[model samples]
Target: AVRVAYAGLRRKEAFKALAEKLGFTPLLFPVQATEKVPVPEYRDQVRALAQGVDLFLATTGVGVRDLLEAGKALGLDLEGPLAKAFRLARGAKAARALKEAGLPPHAVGDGTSKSLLPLLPQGRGVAALQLYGKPLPLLENALAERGYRVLPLMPYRHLPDPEGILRLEEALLRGEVDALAFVAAIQVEFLFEGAKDPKALREALNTRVKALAVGRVTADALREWGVKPFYVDETERLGSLLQGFKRALQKEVA
Candidate 1:
């Protein structure tokens, strides 16, 4: 049976059941998202940029949903204002959320922002970036260098569990896991942070294990930690991810 480590907050049962159905051993290392905290700095920034931004990049479904919730709590109208700018979705999830909010994106990214940013028509104006978990400095820099003023809005923060983290470290070090599936960027952060020797952990993951990321963002997260994934799901869904991993396993056996 393939020993798989699933690092995701939701769909624990679904992930486990999928593994069982596929005759793979599943190890759960889920993390939690901390309560939404208001960022006063970004609140004002988003409002100002919303008035006249050239683009709005929706990076996550959770972020888009929670951003509206936070806006309601803060008495801000995020949708009405953001819809005025050219909307861009990172993937299908983000696209669905945007459409539900009555703000359909102008362009949808294939996988990563790297691929999407280039498709953007060249213009110079503010660009509101909506995301979850940690802020992306590199992405911000890329936008800034492209002559776009960046406005970041984080909807929630992810919290790692100590026990789950330690378990992953041991699993990785002992070579007990054959595949490591990272479903979100926060999982990558927690996994790397809990490593005894980050560099060695990266090396081990890079060489010994079959790393999988659910989407471009998660894949980008793995890359940030210096660990390239063996597979990235094109559809950005848990089922798609498992199917891709199953294909890899079949290839290995074949």
Candidate 2:
């Protein structure tokens, strides 16, 4: 049986169900979201939506939902104003989130920054970026250089799971974990940040563990951290990721 570590939040039940159906021993290590919504960190940006945003860059479904919720929390009328913007979604989930809010995207990227960056306008305009966690310097700089005023809306931040991270470290070091599944890029960042020696942890991930990424973004993040993923899901779905794990195991036995 493959022992798997799931590194994402609010999807424990689904992951557990999938693991059981696939006959894999699952480890739930959900990363915490540290969002200070309606607070100073994002209050200005949340309120800025009321004035009017020229564009809406929807990156994640959860982030889109959080942006709307944060705006509502501050008693701002966001729907009509947001509907006026030239919206774009990075993926299906992000598109779905925007649609749910009565704001459909004009275009949707193919699950990569390379795909998304090209779709953005180059001329002067105010763009509200809905990010997963921390600010992306590359994205921000690119937008700025193009004469766009970038208003970053970080609805939530990823916090490292202390005990969970320690356990993951130990499991990888001891070769107890058969596969490590990363649902998001932040999970990769947090896991490495939480490690005492990030270099050794990354080396083990590259050599010892079978690293699986949910999509291109997560795969890119893994590469940025100096650990290449053994498998990257083609469909960018949790089921696909689990299937990739199964395929890897089968290949090992073959």
Candidate 3:
């Protein structure tokens, strides 16, 4: 069995079910956590969204740190109102980011949307920001009700590990590996970009190297590159993705 490590927020029960069905062990690590200070990336996104706002409220430390990181990268002056903005993250990383940026970090809670409402400042025309998984109407609705103009920044994105790609690509080049696996659309996009010869990889797609996608998003990415995924997660769960793998592998053996 192949071992896969995922770095992201944990939904234990959901992940456990997927693992059990796929016969793969799950190693869940925290990719995002709370912080007490600002992050540069978060700050950059805020600046991009709130270009004209006089005051900014960072709902979380990660957001704050992101903004600061972004400001430094963009050479923004951090002496006044921008530095005074509120922020939160739940751990040392958040604190470290702020301290490194010449600011102090604070402590914050990891409450859901409802419990988090109290922490947000109240003001008209203030932009309440978010990063989300989908068009989650609930969070947006609540923000709208509060008279705050909500803006969400998809500040970061997923990509395949270059280490994993190098290992897999080496194996493929030596005629030792037969398949590639991906859990997200970005992974597939990275795979193509990482290829030694894009045209050659495209031509040999179906015969020499098999492709697997964890869901429609990933599958679509692969499909756009003229590679048909041997497996696709119709249920959009890891277990389902793995079952698709099982089916393909079984056919290969037969």
Candidate 4:
């Protein structure tokens, strides 16, 4: 049977089930996993976010929920500050997260960095930016150029799982895996970062093992890595990835 690889730490069973039903073995290759920042250090930032910032930029829904929980662990009330600041969401997840937290977004971007810049108000002020896994210099630098003081907040730290990367890369180069499903953009970085011969790895992905991206952002990452995805799930739904993969497979079979 052909193997399909995924790196998302959560939703383990769902990914496995979808792949199994499609007659593929689901490979659990975790290139990155999220761990929280130390409570003491994160506490002060939480307070500043609630009281100091003029605008709150939420990047991920999980980051928002994690910030709330992380704040509670340090005896701070995040909801109070989030409610006070003008909330700006990068996409559906952050907007949905804000709404769920009782602090809905005043403005929302279409899940892209370029779209987010225009959403910012013309006035200069401090903004608490909740980063998703890694720092976004594109957004931060853009804000700085516009005179916005950006306060970066990373409630959860992304730790690379080196062994998983090695295993997946070996499987890819050995032609053991048939398709690779990328759900996040950072996984692409870690995959190439851990590879001993990145060009060979990219060659294998472009030729033997098919690269699958869950969204346009992820597809763009594959392009940046010099590999075109065999299939792209435009809807950005995990379930839809399997359906699109199935459709692609049928097309190949025909």
Across residues 1-254, which tens digit of lDDT does each residue of candidate 4 receive? 77888877766789999988988888888787454344344566777776767788988787788887878887877777677678898878888988988899999987655578987776588888887666778889887877879888875567778888888888888887888888877788778877878998899988888899887767766877789889989998889998889888889889
Off by over 4 Å in 3: 1-39, 50-153, 157-163, 248-254
Candidate 4 yields a Cα-based lDDT of 0.81
Question: Model 1: which residue pairs collide?
Answer: none
What lDDT is reached at residue 73 by model 4? 80
lDDT of each: 0.77, 0.79, 0.52, 0.81
Comparing 2 and 4 by lDDT, which wins? 4
Q: Mark the 10 consecutive residues where model 4 has the least summed lDDT.
A: 33-42
Q: What is the lDDT of residue 232 in candidate 3?
A: 78
> 1-254, model 3: which lDDT tens digit per residue?
54433322334466656655676554433223322223345555556554544223333345456665655676765435435555433234334555566655343433233334555555566443444222225655665676776655445534335555555555555555455556655555565666676566665556675666676656766776778877777676665665667676788689
lDDT per residue for candidate 2 within 152-251, as digits (tens), equals: 8875555566887787787778878777888878788778877777888788888877789987778877887789898999687898789767877789
TM-score of 4: 0.66
Scanning candidate 3 in windows of ten residues, the lowest lDDT window is: 29-38
Arranged by lDDT, best first:
4, 2, 1, 3
Error of 1 at 106 (Å): 16
Between the candidate structures 2 and 4, which one is better when assessed by TM-score? 4
TM-scores vs. true structure, each candidate: 0.63, 0.64, 0.43, 0.66
